[PDB]
C-alpha cells in the first residue's frame, strides 16, 4: 500500500472545501471574481485533483500562503470569513492534533508556499514513521536562521521577457528606485564625461561598457526593469576595491553598480529584496535538501581511524621531528595528501618546496577559496592558455587583496607551469559573511566537504588542499561534531608559522562538539519508541500461504555459504526435538506462556539465547473500533543474527500442511506474521514478552487508524 487509508499521514481532503463550496461561501453580490480569488480557486482545484500526496501537501501549503497574502492585501474583503475557514481546514488536514509544536514551528516560517513548509512536513512525517533519522528539529533551526528561507519575500513575481537569454536570478522591477538612494553616484569624477543627472541614468552606461569589456555580462535593462544573472555571492567575491579601482583592470563600474544594488537593498536580505519568486523558491528547497545531506554525512562518523594516525597527543612533535623533505615524502607517499591553512605563508612554503611534492607524485592542487560552480570552466580555460577567465581573474584579485604578485595567483600559475591539476572545491551558495551562525557555517562547510569527497579521495591521486581553518578540522554540528575536510579525507591539516615552520594543526577537543541548542518551543520527540514500525499500511500475503519451500531462500540467504549447513542442522534439531514439539500450541489466545518455555529448551539444547521478538498491530472490530493484536517468539542466536523459534504460529491462518514450529530470521518472521494476519500498522519490538507485557503490547498510539474527522 503506497497510499494507505490506514496511515495517519494520508493527507485526507474530507474536511477541506471543494471549489464549488468555496464559490458559494466566498461570493459577494456585486463583486466579480478578481485575479487573486481566481488563483485561490484554481489552487484549491489542483489540491482536490492531486493524487501524489507529497505534491498534495505542497499545494496545500501554497494555498495557505495565497490566503495569507490576500488577507494582508485586502483586510476588509468580505471574502475573508470563507478564506480563513478554508485556511484552518488546510492546517487541520496537514497537522494532526498531536503535532501542535511541529505545526507552530513550521507555520511560523514566512512564505508557506516557498517549499520550506513542504520539505519540513515531509521530513517530520518520515521521522515520525521511522523512515528517516532525527533531523526535523535541526532542519527547522537551519531554516529559521537562514537569510533567504526565513525572510518574508519582497522580490519580483512578474514575467521574464523572452529577449533575455540567460537564467534570471534577480529583478529590479522599477529602475527609478536607484534615484531614491542617498548616494549620487552620478556626481562622482569617473562619470563626468558621460553627462548624466541621476543614478538610474548612469545604469545603461555601466552595463554596456561592462558587456564590451568583460564584467556584468548577465545584466540587462528592458523597459525600466533590470534583470540580473550573476548570483549575489559571485558578485560579492569578484567585485570590491581590490578588483575595482579607477585606472584598474576592471575599473570602478562594476563596483559602482554593485554598491548601489546594496544601497537599494537596505535593511532587507539581498534575495528577499531582488530574487524572482522562482529563484527564491528553488534556493529554499535546494538549501534544505543540501543541509539534510550534510547532516546525514555527519551521522555516526567514526573518528577512530583518523585519531589512530594523527590524534595522539604527540603527533605534532612526531610531525616536527621529520625533516621537511621526510614530511613531504610521508604526505605524498603514505597519506596521499595533506591540507594547509588558507594563508599566503602556507602557499609560499608549498611553492618553495614544489619540486619535492612533484617528485613524490603530486597530481592535484585544490582550494576552497574559489567556487567551482562559477569558475571551474574558467580555471580550465586558464590552464589551457586561454584568456577567457575574467571572473576568475577578478576573484583572484580579491583573494590576493589586489596584490599583482599574490599567492593565490602564484599557486594557480604554478599549476599551469608545472602541468598539475588545479581544482576549486568551494561552492558559492551561502558563502558571503557574516558567518555569525553555526547552521550557515555547517551548510557552507558541508557542501565543500561533499565536493572534496567526490573529487579528491580517488585512486591514483596525490593532492594538496588549501582551506580556511574552519573547514580543515572539526566544527560544531547537529547533535554531534561536523568532521573537517581532513578527517573525511584521512589526511593531516597543517599550518606554516611566522617563523616559516611547517606544523601540524590538531583537531582540538573544544571544536569536536554539537552545536549548543535550546529546545524548540514545546518540542515533542518525533522518532518512534521501540524497534520498528514495519509500515503505515495493511500488510497482506503476496502469493498464497508461506511454506517451508518458500521460506528456504530466506534461511539460506541469512548466512554465508560456509555457515549454511550448520544453520540447517540446528534448525533440523529444533524442529525434531521432542520437548520442543511438546510445547507446540495452536489455539488462539492460549499460548501466552510458550516463549519462555521455548527459550529454556533452546538453552538446554546448548543453543545461544536470543532476545526474542514481539509484533503488535491493529485489527478492525465491529462498529468501527480497532483492537490491538499481538504475537511473540523466543529466538536463538547464530552467526550474529537472531532466528525466531515460534512454536505457536499455527494459532494464525496457515497452509494446511505447515510445520508446527516456525523458524525464520526475526525480520522475516515479523513480516510473515504481519502478512498472514493482514496486520494494520504493525510494530515490532526486538524482545519476547509474556503476561501483562504481552497482553497490552500495542503499536504507537498515533498509528491507531483514524478518520480524517473534519467537515
Ligand atoms: O502569515 C500569516 C501569519 O502566519 C504565521 O502565524 C500563523 O501560524 C502560527 C503557527 O501555527 C500561529 O501561532 C498563528 O496564530 C497563525 O496566525 C506567522 O507566525 C504570523 O506572523 C503571520 O501573521
Ligand atoms: O516588493 C514588495 C512586495 O513584496 C511582496 O510581494 C511580492 O511577492 C508576492 C509573493 O511571491 C507576489 O504575489 C507579489 O506579486 C510580489 O510583488 C509582498 O507580499 C508585498 O506586500 C510587497 O509590497
Amino acid at each position: 500500500l503506497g497510499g494507505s487509508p490506514y496511515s495517519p499521514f494520508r493527507i485526507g481532503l474530507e474536511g477541506v472545501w471543494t471549489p464549488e463550496v468555496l464559490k458559494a461561501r466566498a461570493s459577494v453580490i456585486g463583486k466579480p471574481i478578481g485575479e487573486s480569488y481566481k488563483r485561490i480557486l484554481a489552487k484549491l482545484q489542483r489540491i482536490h485533483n492531486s493524487n501524489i500526496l507529497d505534491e498534495r501537501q505542497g499545494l496545500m501549503h501554497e494555498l495557505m500562503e495565497l490566503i495569507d497574502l490576500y488577507e494582508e492585501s485586502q483586510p476588509s474583503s468580505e471574502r475573508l470569513n470563507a478564506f480563513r475557514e478554508l485556511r484552518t481546514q488546510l492546517e487541520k488536514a496537514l497537522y494532526l492534533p498531536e503535532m501542535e509544536a511541529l505545526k507552530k514551528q513550521i507555520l511560523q516560517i514566512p512564505n508557506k508556499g516557498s517549499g520550506a513548509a513542504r520539505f519540513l512536513l515531509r521530513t517530520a512525517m518520515n521521522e515520525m514513521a521511522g523512515k528517516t533519522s532525527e533531523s526535523t528539529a535541526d532542519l527547522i533551526r537551519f531554516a529559521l536562521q537562514d537569510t533567504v528561507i526565513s525572510a518574508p519575500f519582497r522580490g519580483y513575481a512578474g514575467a521574464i521577457p523572452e529577449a533575455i537569454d540567460f537564467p534570471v536570478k534577480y529583478v529590479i522591477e522599477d529602475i527609478s528606485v536607484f534615484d531614491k538612494i542617498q548616494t549620487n553616484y552620478w556626481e562622482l569624477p569617473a562619470y563626468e564625461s558621460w553627462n548624466e543627472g541621476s543614478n538610474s541614468a548612469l545604469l545603461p552606461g555601466l552595463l554596456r561598457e561592462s558587456q564590451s569589456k568583460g564584467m556584468l555580462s548577465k545584466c540587462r535593462i528592458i523597459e525600466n526593469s533590470l534583470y540580473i544573472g550573476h548570483s549575489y555571492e559571485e558578485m560579492f567575491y569578484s567585485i570590491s576595491p581590490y578588483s575595482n579601482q579607477v585606472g584598474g583592470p576592471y575599473e570602478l563600474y562594476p563596483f559602482t553598480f554593485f554598491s548601489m544594488l546594496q544601497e537599494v537593498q537596505g535593511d532587507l536580505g539581498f534575495e528577499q529584496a531582488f530574487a524572482t519568486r522562482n529563484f527564491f523558491n528553488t534556493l529554499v528547497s535546494d538549501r534544505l535538501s543540501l543541509m539534510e545531506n550534510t547532516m546525514l554525512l555527519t551521522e555516526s562518523f567514526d573518528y577512530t581511524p583518523w585519531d589512530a594516525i594523527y590524534g595522539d597527543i604527540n603527533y605534532d612533535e612526531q610531525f616536527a621531528a621529520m625533516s621537511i623533505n621526510e614530511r613531504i615524502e610521508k604526505c605524498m607517499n603514505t597519506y596521499r595528501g595533506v591540507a594547509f591553512q588558507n594563508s599566503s605563508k602556507s602557499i609560499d612554503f608549498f611553492l618553495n618546496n614544489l619540486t619535492t611534492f612533484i617528485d613524490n607524485g603530486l597530481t592535484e592542487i585544490a582550494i576552497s577559496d574559489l567556487p567551482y560552480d562559477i569558475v571551474q570552466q574558467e580555471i580550465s580555460q586558464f590552464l589551457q592558455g586561454s584568456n577567457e577567465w575574467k571572473t576568475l581573474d577578478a576573484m583572484l584579485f580579491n583573494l590576493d587583496k589586489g596584490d599583482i604578485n599574490g599567492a593565490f595567483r602564484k599557486l594557480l600559475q604554478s599549476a599551469k607551469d608545472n602541468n598539475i591539476k588545479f581544482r576549486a572545491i568551494g561552492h558559492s551558495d551561502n558563502s558571503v559573511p557574516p558567518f555569525n551562525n553555526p547552521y550557515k557555517s555547517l551548510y557552507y562547510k558541508g557542501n565543500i566537504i561533499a565536493e572534496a569527497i567526490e573529487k579528491l579521495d580517488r585512486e591514483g591521486q596525490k593532492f594538496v588542499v588549501f582551506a580556511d581553518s574552519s573547514l580543515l578540522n572539526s566544527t560544531p554540528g547537529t547533535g554531534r561534531p561536523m568532521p573537517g575536510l581532513v578527517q573525511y579525507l584521512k589526511i593531516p591539516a597543517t599550518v606554516v608559522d611566522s617563523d616559516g615552520a611547517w606544523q601540524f594543526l590538531p583537531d582540538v577537543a573544544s571544536s569536536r562538539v554539537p552545536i549548543e541548542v535550546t529546545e524548540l518551543e514545546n518540542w515533542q520527540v518525533l522518532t518512534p519508541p521501540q524497534g520498528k514500525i514495519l509500515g503505515l499500511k495493511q500488510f497482506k500475503l503476496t502469493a498464497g500461504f508461506p511454506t517451508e519451500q518458500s521460506r528456504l531462500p530466506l534461511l539460506e540467504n541469512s548466512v554465508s555459504e560456509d555457515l549454511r549447513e550448520e544453520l540447517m542442522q540446528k534448525i533440523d534439531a529444533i524442529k525434531n526435538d521432542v520437548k520442543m514439539n511438546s510445547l507446540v500450541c495452536m489455539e488462539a489466545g492460549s499460548c501466552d506462556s510458550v516463549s519462555p518455555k521455548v527459550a529454556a529448551r533452546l538453552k538446554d539444547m546448548g543453543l545461544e539465547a536470543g532476545m526474542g521478538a514481539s509484533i503488535t498491530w491493529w485489527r478492525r472490530e465491529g462498529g468501527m473500533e480497532f483492537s490491538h493484536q499481538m504475537h511473540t517468539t523466543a529466538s536463538f542466536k547464530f552467526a550474529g543474527k537472531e532466528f525466531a523459534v515460534d512454536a505457536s504460529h499455527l494459532q494464525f491462518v496457515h497452509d494446511q500442511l505447515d510445520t508446527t514450529i516456525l523458524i525464520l530470521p526475526v525480520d522475516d518472521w515479523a513480516l510473515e506474521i504481519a502478512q498472514r494476519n493482514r496486520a494494520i500498522n504493525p510494530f515490532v519490538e526486538y524482545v519476547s514478552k509474556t503476561g501483562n507485557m504481552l497482553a497490552l503490547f500495542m503499536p504507537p498510539l498515533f498509528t491507531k487508524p483514524r478518520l480524517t474527522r473534519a467537515l
Side-chain angles (χ1 to χ4, degrees), residues 574-586 594 597-598 601 647-648 660-661:
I574 296 157
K575 289 179 162 142
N576 287 290
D577 187 75
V578 169
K579 287 168 178 182
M580 274 304 180
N581 282 270
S582 288
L583 293 177
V584 167
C585 183
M586 59 213 105
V594 167
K597 301 173 192 314
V598 171
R601 185 50 190 158
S648 69
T660 50
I661 303 163

PDB file of all heavy atoms in Angstrom, residues 574-586 594 597-598 601 647-648 660-661:
ATOM      1  N   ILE A 574      16.065 -28.489  16.241  1.00  0.00           N
ATOM      2  CA  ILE A 574      14.968 -27.833  16.952  1.00  0.00           C
ATOM      3  C   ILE A 574      13.621 -28.402  16.516  1.00  0.00           C
ATOM      4  O   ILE A 574      12.787 -28.749  17.350  1.00  0.00           O
ATOM      5  CB  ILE A 574      14.992 -26.307  16.734  1.00  0.00           C
ATOM      6  CG1 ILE A 574      16.268 -25.709  17.333  1.00  0.00           C
ATOM      7  CG2 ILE A 574      13.766 -25.658  17.377  1.00  0.00           C
ATOM      8  CD1 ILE A 574      16.681 -24.385  16.734  1.00  0.00           C
ATOM      9  N   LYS A 575      13.419 -28.512  15.204  1.00  0.00           N
ATOM     10  CA  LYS A 575      12.144 -28.995  14.677  1.00  0.00           C
ATOM     11  C   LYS A 575      11.898 -30.458  15.041  1.00  0.00           C
ATOM     12  O   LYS A 575      10.747 -30.890  15.159  1.00  0.00           O
ATOM     13  CB  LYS A 575      12.087 -28.805  13.160  1.00  0.00           C
ATOM     14  CG  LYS A 575      11.969 -27.357  12.762  1.00  0.00           C
ATOM     15  CD  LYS A 575      11.942 -27.187  11.261  1.00  0.00           C
ATOM     16  CE  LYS A 575      11.386 -25.814  10.908  1.00  0.00           C
ATOM     17  NZ  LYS A 575      12.108 -25.222   9.746  1.00  0.00           N
ATOM     18  N   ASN A 576      12.987 -31.205  15.225  1.00  0.00           N
ATOM     19  CA  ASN A 576      12.912 -32.606  15.623  1.00  0.00           C
ATOM     20  C   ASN A 576      13.176 -32.863  17.104  1.00  0.00           C
ATOM     21  O   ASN A 576      13.464 -33.990  17.495  1.00  0.00           O
ATOM     22  CB  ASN A 576      13.841 -33.460  14.756  1.00  0.00           C
ATOM     23  CG  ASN A 576      13.309 -33.634  13.360  1.00  0.00           C
ATOM     24  OD1 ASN A 576      12.315 -34.333  13.149  1.00  0.00           O
ATOM     25  ND2 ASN A 576      13.958 -32.993  12.393  1.00  0.00           N
ATOM     26  N   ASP A 577      13.061 -31.830  17.930  1.00  0.00           N
ATOM     27  CA  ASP A 577      13.218 -32.013  19.367  1.00  0.00           C
ATOM     28  C   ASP A 577      11.880 -32.396  20.003  1.00  0.00           C
ATOM     29  O   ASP A 577      10.875 -31.715  19.805  1.00  0.00           O
ATOM     30  CB  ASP A 577      13.802 -30.758  20.022  1.00  0.00           C
ATOM     31  CG  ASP A 577      14.126 -30.977  21.486  1.00  0.00           C
ATOM     32  OD1 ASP A 577      15.144 -31.648  21.778  1.00  0.00           O
ATOM     33  OD2 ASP A 577      13.344 -30.526  22.335  1.00  0.00           O
ATOM     34  N   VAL A 578      11.870 -33.497  20.754  1.00  0.00           N
ATOM     35  CA  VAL A 578      10.642 -33.998  21.380  1.00  0.00           C
ATOM     36  C   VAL A 578      10.048 -32.964  22.347  1.00  0.00           C
ATOM     37  O   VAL A 578       8.846 -32.699  22.334  1.00  0.00           O
ATOM     38  CB  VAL A 578      10.883 -35.343  22.121  1.00  0.00           C
ATOM     39  CG1 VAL A 578       9.671 -35.719  22.989  1.00  0.00           C
ATOM     40  CG2 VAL A 578      11.202 -36.444  21.128  1.00  0.00           C
ATOM     41  N   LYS A 579      10.900 -32.380  23.178  1.00  0.00           N
ATOM     42  CA  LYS A 579      10.436 -31.407  24.151  1.00  0.00           C
ATOM     43  C   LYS A 579       9.900 -30.127  23.484  1.00  0.00           C
ATOM     44  O   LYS A 579       8.862 -29.606  23.895  1.00  0.00           O
ATOM     45  CB  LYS A 579      11.502 -31.153  25.219  1.00  0.00           C
ATOM     46  CG  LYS A 579      11.620 -32.341  26.170  1.00  0.00           C
ATOM     47  CD  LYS A 579      12.845 -32.299  27.069  1.00  0.00           C
ATOM     48  CE  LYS A 579      12.825 -33.503  28.008  1.00  0.00           C
ATOM     49  NZ  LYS A 579      13.967 -33.538  28.980  1.00  0.00           N
ATOM     50  N   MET A 580      10.575 -29.662  22.429  1.00  0.00           N
ATOM     51  CA  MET A 580      10.079 -28.533  21.622  1.00  0.00           C
ATOM     52  C   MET A 580       8.719 -28.808  21.013  1.00  0.00           C
ATOM     53  O   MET A 580       7.863 -27.923  20.959  1.00  0.00           O
ATOM     54  CB  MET A 580      11.014 -28.202  20.470  1.00  0.00           C
ATOM     55  CG  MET A 580      12.119 -27.280  20.828  1.00  0.00           C
ATOM     56  SD  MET A 580      11.595 -25.710  21.557  1.00  0.00           S
ATOM     57  CE  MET A 580      13.256 -25.111  21.749  1.00  0.00           C
ATOM     58  N   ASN A 581       8.535 -30.025  20.518  1.00  0.00           N
ATOM     59  CA  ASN A 581       7.257 -30.387  19.941  1.00  0.00           C
ATOM     60  C   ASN A 581       6.148 -30.495  20.970  1.00  0.00           C
ATOM     61  O   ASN A 581       5.001 -30.182  20.670  1.00  0.00           O
ATOM     62  CB  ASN A 581       7.387 -31.633  19.082  1.00  0.00           C
ATOM     63  CG  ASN A 581       7.985 -31.320  17.731  1.00  0.00           C
ATOM     64  OD1 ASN A 581       7.257 -31.030  16.779  1.00  0.00           O
ATOM     65  ND2 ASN A 581       9.314 -31.309  17.649  1.00  0.00           N
ATOM     66  N   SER A 582       6.495 -30.910  22.186  1.00  0.00           N
ATOM     67  CA  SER A 582       5.541 -30.916  23.302  1.00  0.00           C
ATOM     68  C   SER A 582       5.008 -29.520  23.603  1.00  0.00           C
ATOM     69  O   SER A 582       3.906 -29.372  24.121  1.00  0.00           O
ATOM     70  CB  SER A 582       6.187 -31.468  24.567  1.00  0.00           C
ATOM     71  OG  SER A 582       6.393 -32.866  24.461  1.00  0.00           O
ATOM     72  N   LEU A 583       5.799 -28.503  23.271  1.00  0.00           N
ATOM     73  CA  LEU A 583       5.473 -27.111  23.585  1.00  0.00           C
ATOM     74  C   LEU A 583       4.537 -26.472  22.573  1.00  0.00           C
ATOM     75  O   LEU A 583       3.973 -25.399  22.825  1.00  0.00           O
ATOM     76  CB  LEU A 583       6.758 -26.283  23.670  1.00  0.00           C
ATOM     77  CG  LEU A 583       7.692 -26.630  24.826  1.00  0.00           C
ATOM     78  CD1 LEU A 583       8.934 -25.787  24.751  1.00  0.00           C
ATOM     79  CD2 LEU A 583       6.982 -26.463  26.172  1.00  0.00           C
ATOM     80  N   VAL A 584       4.387 -27.127  21.424  1.00  0.00           N
ATOM     81  CA  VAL A 584       3.604 -26.590  20.318  1.00  0.00           C
ATOM     82  C   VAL A 584       2.171 -26.249  20.746  1.00  0.00           C
ATOM     83  O   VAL A 584       1.481 -27.067  21.342  1.00  0.00           O
ATOM     84  CB  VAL A 584       3.614 -27.557  19.119  1.00  0.00           C
ATOM     85  CG1 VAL A 584       2.561 -27.172  18.101  1.00  0.00           C
ATOM     86  CG2 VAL A 584       4.999 -27.577  18.491  1.00  0.00           C
ATOM     87  N   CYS A 585       1.756 -25.023  20.444  1.00  0.00           N
ATOM     88  CA  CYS A 585       0.429 -24.532  20.780  1.00  0.00           C
ATOM     89  C   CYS A 585      -0.224 -23.968  19.518  1.00  0.00           C
ATOM     90  O   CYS A 585       0.441 -23.319  18.716  1.00  0.00           O
ATOM     91  CB  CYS A 585       0.566 -23.447  21.849  1.00  0.00           C
ATOM     92  SG  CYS A 585      -0.974 -22.775  22.456  1.00  0.00           S
ATOM     93  N   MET A 586      -1.518 -24.215  19.325  1.00  0.00           N
ATOM     94  CA  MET A 586      -2.184 -23.685  18.128  1.00  0.00           C
ATOM     95  C   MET A 586      -3.601 -23.146  18.334  1.00  0.00           C
ATOM     96  O   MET A 586      -4.278 -22.783  17.367  1.00  0.00           O
ATOM     97  CB  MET A 586      -2.117 -24.679  16.960  1.00  0.00           C
ATOM     98  CG  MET A 586      -2.730 -26.038  17.195  1.00  0.00           C
ATOM     99  SD  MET A 586      -1.806 -27.291  16.266  1.00  0.00           S
ATOM    100  CE  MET A 586      -0.883 -28.067  17.588  1.00  0.00           C
ATOM    101  N   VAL A 594       4.198 -19.717  26.178  1.00  0.00           N
ATOM    102  CA  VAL A 594       5.054 -20.596  25.382  1.00  0.00           C
ATOM    103  C   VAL A 594       6.497 -20.104  25.180  1.00  0.00           C
ATOM    104  O   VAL A 594       7.435 -20.899  25.304  1.00  0.00           O
ATOM    105  CB  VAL A 594       4.379 -20.955  24.026  1.00  0.00           C
ATOM    106  CG1 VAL A 594       5.378 -21.597  23.048  1.00  0.00           C
ATOM    107  CG2 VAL A 594       3.189 -21.882  24.268  1.00  0.00           C
ATOM    108  N   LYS A 597       9.255 -21.018  27.683  1.00  0.00           N
ATOM    109  CA  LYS A 597       9.478 -22.464  27.683  1.00  0.00           C
ATOM    110  C   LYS A 597      10.361 -22.852  26.490  1.00  0.00           C
ATOM    111  O   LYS A 597      11.253 -23.701  26.604  1.00  0.00           O
ATOM    112  CB  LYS A 597       8.151 -23.218  27.637  1.00  0.00           C
ATOM    113  CG  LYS A 597       7.208 -22.927  28.796  1.00  0.00           C
ATOM    114  CD  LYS A 597       5.847 -23.595  28.589  1.00  0.00           C
ATOM    115  CE  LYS A 597       4.786 -23.081  29.574  1.00  0.00           C
ATOM    116  NZ  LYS A 597       5.270 -22.996  30.985  1.00  0.00           N
ATOM    117  N   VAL A 598      10.112 -22.225  25.345  1.00  0.00           N
ATOM    118  CA  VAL A 598      10.969 -22.421  24.178  1.00  0.00           C
ATOM    119  C   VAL A 598      12.400 -21.960  24.462  1.00  0.00           C
ATOM    120  O   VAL A 598      13.353 -22.693  24.190  1.00  0.00           O
ATOM    121  CB  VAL A 598      10.377 -21.716  22.930  1.00  0.00           C
ATOM    122  CG1 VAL A 598      11.357 -21.724  21.768  1.00  0.00           C
ATOM    123  CG2 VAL A 598       9.069 -22.392  22.549  1.00  0.00           C
ATOM    124  N   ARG A 601      14.195 -24.512  26.671  1.00  0.00           N
ATOM    125  CA  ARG A 601      14.609 -25.715  25.931  1.00  0.00           C
ATOM    126  C   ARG A 601      15.798 -25.429  25.010  1.00  0.00           C
ATOM    127  O   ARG A 601      16.738 -26.217  24.949  1.00  0.00           O
ATOM    128  CB  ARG A 601      13.430 -26.337  25.165  1.00  0.00           C
ATOM    129  CG  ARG A 601      13.738 -27.669  24.457  1.00  0.00           C
ATOM    130  CD  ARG A 601      14.429 -28.701  25.368  1.00  0.00           C
ATOM    131  NE  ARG A 601      14.913 -29.854  24.613  1.00  0.00           N
ATOM    132  CZ  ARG A 601      15.873 -30.680  25.020  1.00  0.00           C
ATOM    133  NH1 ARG A 601      16.475 -30.498  26.189  1.00  0.00           N
ATOM    134  NH2 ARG A 601      16.239 -31.690  24.246  1.00  0.00           N
ATOM    135  N   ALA A 647       6.852 -21.744  18.248  1.00  0.00           N
ATOM    136  CA  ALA A 647       6.080 -22.967  18.404  1.00  0.00           C
ATOM    137  C   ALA A 647       4.574 -22.714  18.562  1.00  0.00           C
ATOM    138  O   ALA A 647       3.796 -23.648  18.799  1.00  0.00           O
ATOM    139  CB  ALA A 647       6.615 -23.773  19.585  1.00  0.00           C
ATOM    140  N   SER A 648       4.152 -21.472  18.379  1.00  0.00           N
ATOM    141  CA  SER A 648       2.727 -21.159  18.485  1.00  0.00           C
ATOM    142  C   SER A 648       2.150 -20.387  17.301  1.00  0.00           C
ATOM    143  O   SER A 648       1.072 -19.819  17.406  1.00  0.00           O
ATOM    144  CB  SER A 648       2.447 -20.440  19.806  1.00  0.00           C
ATOM    145  OG  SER A 648       3.018 -19.151  19.794  1.00  0.00           O
ATOM    146  N   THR A 660       4.810 -27.197  12.460  1.00  0.00           N
ATOM    147  CA  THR A 660       4.304 -26.708  13.751  1.00  0.00           C
ATOM    148  C   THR A 660       5.207 -25.655  14.398  1.00  0.00           C
ATOM    149  O   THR A 660       4.742 -24.848  15.192  1.00  0.00           O
ATOM    150  CB  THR A 660       4.129 -27.850  14.768  1.00  0.00           C
ATOM    151  OG1 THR A 660       5.334 -28.619  14.820  1.00  0.00           O
ATOM    152  CG2 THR A 660       2.962 -28.756  14.374  1.00  0.00           C
ATOM    153  N   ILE A 661       6.496 -25.685  14.079  1.00  0.00           N
ATOM    154  CA  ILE A 661       7.447 -24.741  14.671  1.00  0.00           C
ATOM    155  C   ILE A 661       8.037 -23.882  13.565  1.00  0.00           C
ATOM    156  O   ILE A 661       8.719 -24.395  12.662  1.00  0.00           O
ATOM    157  CB  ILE A 661       8.592 -25.460  15.452  1.00  0.00           C
ATOM    158  CG1 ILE A 661       8.024 -26.377  16.546  1.00  0.00           C
ATOM    159  CG2 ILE A 661       9.588 -24.443  16.037  1.00  0.00           C
ATOM    160  CD1 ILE A 661       9.032 -27.406  17.052  1.00  0.00           C
TER     161      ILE A 661
END
